Design a protein around this ligand. Structure first.
Ligand code: FYA
Ligand code: FYA
Ligand code: MG
Lengths: 336, 780, 250, 73
RNA sequence: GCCGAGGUAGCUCAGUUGGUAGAGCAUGCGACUGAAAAUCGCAGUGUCCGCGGUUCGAUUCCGCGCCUCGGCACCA
């Protein structure tokens, strides 16, 4: 109600003012005894009593309605905004990448639809290749499709779906020059019947460290670091010889899982093979770029994401990731 | 420190240019804040010789007759204007920097003043303007242009770090430029002493304050103004010439960073006594300032018979009375090393900062006194034609610096360099060290003046710099970190993710001063701060914050006043203080709410926030629920605590109305948890592929009951096979008792291996109705 | 907040070099802020920081090993005290960067605050050289201003690093040298103060046969130059019109 | 989309915000029509602004709103 | 720890032959709308830093201490 009880400031102001500052002000100071004090008084006797009274009056009138009215069952469900989440494959990948990032590795990705040149040939896996059977290639057919190589040039060859991310080794090298450390995550496709620990579409993680002075000791150090970061100080790695046409001193590695007392076989590894360096530089000439991998050496490694994820998040079956079940996914909302 | 290029170039003759010197001093460890040309003196200013100074009757002015080649007169009100001195005569038609309008013939109190005799301010050589410059009467031939004997100078402004008090002296600074291979020229104080007794005695009474104290004796003095080179030099260094004696003291001081002071013997009495001021004693220093003395002040006193009086505030500033003037013939020269702490204390106790104290605080050569005495005594003999005595008066026997084990192998190890041993030993020797070694680890003993060289690491630094940090190569270390370092960064990545997640939903991050206004303790109804300040930027910023919202809210008011945000969802992560420092997360909602820019239907307030928050921990996969709790700063109607994973950690509600009213603010909501938030390890759990038997069921409950207790009970007895739950509606209406409400839940059961029969669900839906009764609730 | 966008990027930059990100307390003890860092009383060199002194009974400040640390309470004038704390806690070799809000007593202006953020970098280990310190900054430089960037080291003094230095990074896209922070090889007495403190806590010495470098930079100033904020008093200002500007810096 | 695009456009540089606080397709309006009520907001960098300036703008917005083919309740 | 200047309505701020404690957006009921806006009267949240004075509503003399600044002395 005071809204007016306020405006009354001029209702009492000007009006009352029509007594002093409105009745000969060029002589008012020569009249000061009583009359001026009449207002000096009322001007104070009113402003304080009035203006404040009405205030505190409502200051305890409005603030009173609320205190009483507003009563909520706080513990009552509230607005239902949505709450996102990230796929388990990503949670893992991210952590793997953050793990290698700390070692100085760069994270770059490549295409899923490759050419027989980058997936096999440049990797030393010629035709009818006996060793070309660990991957069960998905062949493609498509006219009007423009696959493009490293230097944005149109790359030719029989199109297909990369059977591993290793082709990013060949691509990234014709593009950049050493020294460098790269890890290239990615979805790969193979032709094999699926089961509890197998898929036809899964993810790997390449690691390529080229440079003069690079040794297998360095390859072993990386895995030793991958191991620690993933299973703590009480972890350890195991390297055993194995074959890949693109790494001569080849190896397969396993990390020791303390909290489970079991050796897990993570991926392949080894020192980059002489002919991959040859295929790279060789490809560069074709593109008029000077050779760069002539005086260097380097190591590569590639691991199965899902399998690490599985063991890492406890998912019993590998066919869950690409399943699509919201009841499955939502489970990981919070892995950081 | 002002460094007059040419003054330096006198010790370091081959310097390239002010530019290069700055480049050089840079690599040596001193950066120049600025460089500047200083003495532009027009051709109109000449040297003149005051033949006679005649007082203009009736005035306070003087008619000066000057030999300025030809004879001229000039009027001047300068007290210091007298017969027999030289002056800087600005001829009519001269453009002065310091006073811009063109000087000319002007009649003053009856005399055709032919131009005017300048002063430090008027010539642009100093800020002083209370007198004319005073040149040696025979300085130059009357009439020669002044510049011809006072060239434009260049002054560098050098930052001299505390580890280089030897550098507060150009001769010291010079010694570094030397090590880079620059020729060094040390002045050779050429004394012609006389073996005769000193008319006074020394009596150091506080050897603790005056570790090393020496007095000199120069007599038969002829006090007069300094030659131009001296006056020019002092000015470029920020100081104003005062005469013969006094000037040489200041000159030397700047040269070798050794403050000294000439006491007039007329006042010295029997001898000089270095003691502490007698709590009470008064002293009027040079600045004209009359001061009282704290019994802790180290004084330079004199005694007469059975008397004792102060003559100067030791190491800080000399006394006004005994200063040398024109009528002085003999002095007692003070050149000592005073306790750095004593000076520091005293200097500040009296709010004084002199070139003297500044050096005595930072550090003086513990054995550079005597060489300094000769430099001063020599100069006094050459400019004041003094007759220096042969013996000094020493008090204290400092011990020369000790040896430092120096291995050029380690120098190169610690630097990542491979400097040949030879270059190292060479350098060290240029900086004045004594390298008494055979190899591999030498016995390097530094110069008395290097106070910053005690360790073998100190020495290795000397190589890097004199060799050039730019010569230390780039590299990258490779190693496996010790095991107790693995994952040390979890706590960090955790909180960071957090912020990132919040910023996800829609919260705007906000940083707020750790400071708190003691008043807000009452203004928001909180407990007063435990940690306060002994030096607040302002009482408003007097204490250390105990909550994050007082600020979050304030930044709101401040927003709505500069701009009027129609709405705002905010958050802040910061350190709070109280019993223990702890990280907190705070939020704040306010405004219309979330809805449609048009359609009036808005979604907001308390439940909007609890909305986001539930959505929040949802993302983090953490248990969250609120349970009404009284919080002195939240509407009693809307106020509870927050429960993350079961453990309480904060609160969520609306700001207390009474408060909003004071800060003249609308309604507002907030929360403030405490970090780190609970950590729930994840346990994957295959979800059954068998259909979830689900059923609805309302529960008539008394209006006062909280939805929290209801659900807690339903879920509880709802059985294990219970998948979901949910509250699809709350009804407080007609077909229900008085003061009651019904909560309709959408339950959902499910079995892992096989489907379930309704005979099982009932045996459960029932178990829920039974406890719903045993307690005291209905079931519509 | 802009301070965070920056910090994050700085941390991500050093993370890639193998550095660990740990934080320390804002309310320190005169022991970790000065003493253990070689800045004794009435210390002439104890004046680059204008200490904020505190007063509070019932306040429990706690040191590294969760023990109750004694001494005159205050607000850390730099993050460097995290150097002393982290070393009594862990053992070498290691690489750490510890971001944090620091408080100083100085009148504010366009490029000054009383409350601002720094970033420590401590790499201890046997075989560590100043060449390694210079390599880090050279990397900090690149990552922040591209291949055409370069660093500049000039001697300077700090009681806790003997061969001390101040560094600047070359900003191509602006042709100007920016002075980022201090640096240098950890001083012999800090290693001494650490191990020395450990004994007191019954832990074996660990920094006897090692060497190491530290560096500390001003976040805001880097931020400012990095995001173009003309005045430093904006960060802690509170203006939503200012903040919202950075919604999207990734 | 077209409405706002036009309003903001001719709304002048000094225009800070804009906003659509309500869309009305009702009675006091022609057939097959609707009104869009915008909450504009202008602002000057160095000094305050006089309503004589805003009008010379609020108007420029009404003129193009007509040259085009829209009304202005 | 010295000279000198400012510190007044959700905000930006001039000011002083004083009736103006206010002007410029902005803000509070009737009533023009469904809901607003450009509108006409009707009005002032203002301790014109805080403790104390100052005329008939005080900002200003005037007292000391506080938020702000230049210079100064240090040196971030
Ligand atoms: N169907 C599937 N489902 C899940 N993970 C699979 C998989 N097929 C393969 N993997 C994972 O993929 C990893 C590597 O694939 P593999 O074909 O064995 O080697 C592939 C090479 N491209 C890796 C390599 C790179 C560089 C140097 C040496 C080796 C395996 O260790 C395995 O854990
Ligand atoms: N008021 C302020 N506002 C913004 N930035 C500031 C600041 N005061 C200082 N800084 C920044 O803080 C940086 C370092 O602080 P400063 O006090 O100079 O050295 C501080 C040492 N703690 C750094 C150091 C660590 C390890 C080895 C050597 C040195 C400066 O380079 C500057 O850019
Ligand atoms: Mg040194």
């Amino acid at each position: 109600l005071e809204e007016l009880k306020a405006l009354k400031a001029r209702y009492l102001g000007k009006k009352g003012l029509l007594t002093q500052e409105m009745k000969g002000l060029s002589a008012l100071p020569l009249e000061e005894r009583r009359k001026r004090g009449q207002e000096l008084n009322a001007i104070k006797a009113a402003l304080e009593a009035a203006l404040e009274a009405r205030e505190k009056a409502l200051e305890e009138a409005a603030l009173k309605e609320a205190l009483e009215r507003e009563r909520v069952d706080v513990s009552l469900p509230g607005a239902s905004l949505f709450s996102g989440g990230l796929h388990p494959i990503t949670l893992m990948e991210r952590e793997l990448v953050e793990i290698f990032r700390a070692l100085g590795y760069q994270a770059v990705e490549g295409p899923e639809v490759e050419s027989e040149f980058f997936n096999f040939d440049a990797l030393n896996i010629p035709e009818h290749h006996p060793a070309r059977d660990m991957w069960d290639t998905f062949w493609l057919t498509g006219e009007g499709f423009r696959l493009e190589g490293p230097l944005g040039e149109e790359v030719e060859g029989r199109l297909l779906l990369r059977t591993h991310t290793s082709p990013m080794q060949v691509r990234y090298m014709v593009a950049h020059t050493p020294p460098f450390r790269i890890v290239v995550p990615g979805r790969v496709f193979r032709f094999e019947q699926t089961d509890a620990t197998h898929e036809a579409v899964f993810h790997q993680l390449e690691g390529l460290v080229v440079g003069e002075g690079i040794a297998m000791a360095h390859l072993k150090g990386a895995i030793y670091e991958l191991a620690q970061a993933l299973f703590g100080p009480d972890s350890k790695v195991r390297f055993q010889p194995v074959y890949f046409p693109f790494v001569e001193p080849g190896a397969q590695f396993a990390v020791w899982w303390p909290e489970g007392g079991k050796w897990l076989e993570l991926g392949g590894a080894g020192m980059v093979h002489p002919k991959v360096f040859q295929a790279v530089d060789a490809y560069r000439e074709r593109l008029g770029l000077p050779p760069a991998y002539r005086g260097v050496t380097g190591f590569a490694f590639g691991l199965g994401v899902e399998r690490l994820a599985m063991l890492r998040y406890g998912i019993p079956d590998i066919r869950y990731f690409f399943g699509g079940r919201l009841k499955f996914l939502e489970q990981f909302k919070g892995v950081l | 420190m002002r460094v007059p290029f040419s003054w330096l170039k006198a010790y370091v003759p081959e310097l390239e240019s002010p530019e290069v010197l700055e480049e050089r001093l840079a690599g040596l460890g001193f950066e120049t804040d600025r460089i500047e040309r200083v003495f532009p003196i027009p051709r109109g200013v000449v040297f003149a010789r005051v033949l006679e100074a005649h007082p203009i009757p009736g005035t306070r002015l003087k008619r000066l007759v000057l030999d300025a080649g030809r004879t001229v007169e000039v009027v001047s009100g300068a007290e210091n204007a007298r017969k027999g001195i030289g002056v800087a005569l600005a001829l009519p038609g001269t453009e002065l920097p310091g006073l811009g309008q063109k000087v000319g013939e002007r009649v003053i109190q009856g005399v055709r003043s032919f131009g005017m005799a300048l002063s430090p301010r008027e010539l642009g050589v100093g800020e002083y303007g209370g007198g004319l410059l005073e040149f040696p009467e025979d300085a130059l031939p009357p009439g020669t242009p002044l510049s011809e004997a006072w060239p434009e100078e260049v002054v560098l402004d050098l930052e001299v770090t505390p580890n280089r008090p030897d550098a507060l002296g150009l001769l010291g600074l010079a010694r570094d430029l030397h090590a880079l291979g620059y020729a060094l020229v040390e002045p050779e104080a050429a004394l012609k002493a006389e073996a005769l007794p000193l008319p006074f005695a020394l009596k150091v009474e506080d050897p603790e304050g005056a570790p090393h104290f020496t007095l000199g004796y120069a007599f038969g003095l002829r006090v007069a103004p300094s030659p131009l080179w001296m006056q020019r030099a002092l000015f470029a260094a920020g100081m104003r010439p005062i005469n013969n004696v006094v000037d040489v003291t200041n000159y030397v001081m700047l040269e070798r960073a050794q403050p000294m002071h000439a006491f007039d013997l007329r006042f010295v009495g029997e001898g000089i006594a270095v003691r502490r001021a007698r709590e009470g004693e008064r002293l009027k220093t040079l600045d004209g300032v009359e001061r009282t003395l704290h019994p802790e002040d180290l004084v330079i006193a004199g005694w007469r018979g059975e008397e004792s009086f102060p003559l100067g505030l030791a190491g800080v500033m000399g006394g006004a009375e005994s200063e040398v003037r024109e009528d002085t013939e003999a002095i007692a020269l003070e050149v000592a090393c005073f306790d750095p702490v004593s000076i520091r204390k005293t200097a500040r106790r009296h709010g004084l900062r002199t070139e003297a104290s500044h050096r005595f605080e930072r550090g003086v050569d513990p054995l550079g006194q005597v060489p300094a005495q000769r430099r001063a005594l020599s100069l006094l003999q050459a400019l004041a034609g003094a007759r220096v005595a042969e013996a000094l008066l020493e008090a204290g026997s400092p011990k020369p610096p000790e040896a430092i084990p120096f291995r050029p192998e380690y120098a190169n190890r610690l630097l990542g360099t491979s400097y040949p041993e030879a270059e190292q030993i060479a350098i060290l020797k240029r900086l004045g060290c004594r390298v008494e070694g055979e190899g591999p680890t030498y016995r390097v003993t530094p110069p008395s003046h290097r106070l910053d060289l005690r360790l073998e690491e100190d020495l290795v630094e000397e190589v890097a710099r004199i060799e050039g940090y730019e010569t230390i190569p780039l590299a990258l270390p490779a190693f496996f970190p010790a095991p107790d370092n693995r994952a040390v960064e979890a706590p960090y990545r955790k909180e960071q993710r957090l912020r990132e997640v919040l910023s996800g939903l829609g919260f705007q991050e906000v940083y707020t001063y750790s400071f708190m206004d003691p008043e807000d303790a009452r203004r928001f109804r909180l407990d007063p701060p435990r940690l306060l300040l002994l030096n607040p930027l302002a009482p408003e910023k007097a204490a250390l914050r105990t909550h994050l919202f007082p600020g979050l809210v304030r930044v709101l008011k401040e927003n709505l006043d500069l701009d009027r945000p129609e709405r705002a969802l905010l958050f802040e992560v910061g350190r709070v203080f109280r019993e223990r420092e702890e990280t907190h997360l705070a939020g704040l909602l306010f405004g219309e709410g979330v809805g449609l820019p048009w359609a009036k239907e808005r979604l907001s307030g308390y439940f909007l926030l609890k909305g986001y928050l539930e959505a929040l921990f949802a993302r983090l996969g953490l248990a969250f629920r609120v349970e009404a709790e009284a919080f002195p700063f939240l509407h009693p109607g809307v106020s509870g605590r927050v429960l993350v994973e079961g453990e309480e950690v904060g609160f969520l509600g609306a700001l207390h109305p009474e408060i909003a009213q004071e800060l003249e603010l609308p309604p507002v909501h907030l929360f403030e948890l405490r970090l780190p938030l609970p950590d729930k390890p994840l346990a994957f759990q295959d979800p059954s592929r068998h259909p979830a038997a689900f059923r609805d069921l309302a529960v008539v409950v008394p209006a006062p009951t909280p939805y929290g207790e209801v659900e807690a009970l339903v879920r509880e007895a709802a059985g294990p096979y219970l998948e979901s739950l949910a509250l699809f509606d709350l009804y407080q209406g007609p077909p229900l008792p008085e003061g009651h409400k019904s909560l309709a839940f959408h339950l959902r059961f499910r079995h892992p291996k096989r489907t379930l029969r309704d005979e099982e669900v009932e045996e459960a839906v029932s178990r829920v109705a039974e406890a719903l009764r045993a307690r005291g609730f209905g079931l519509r």
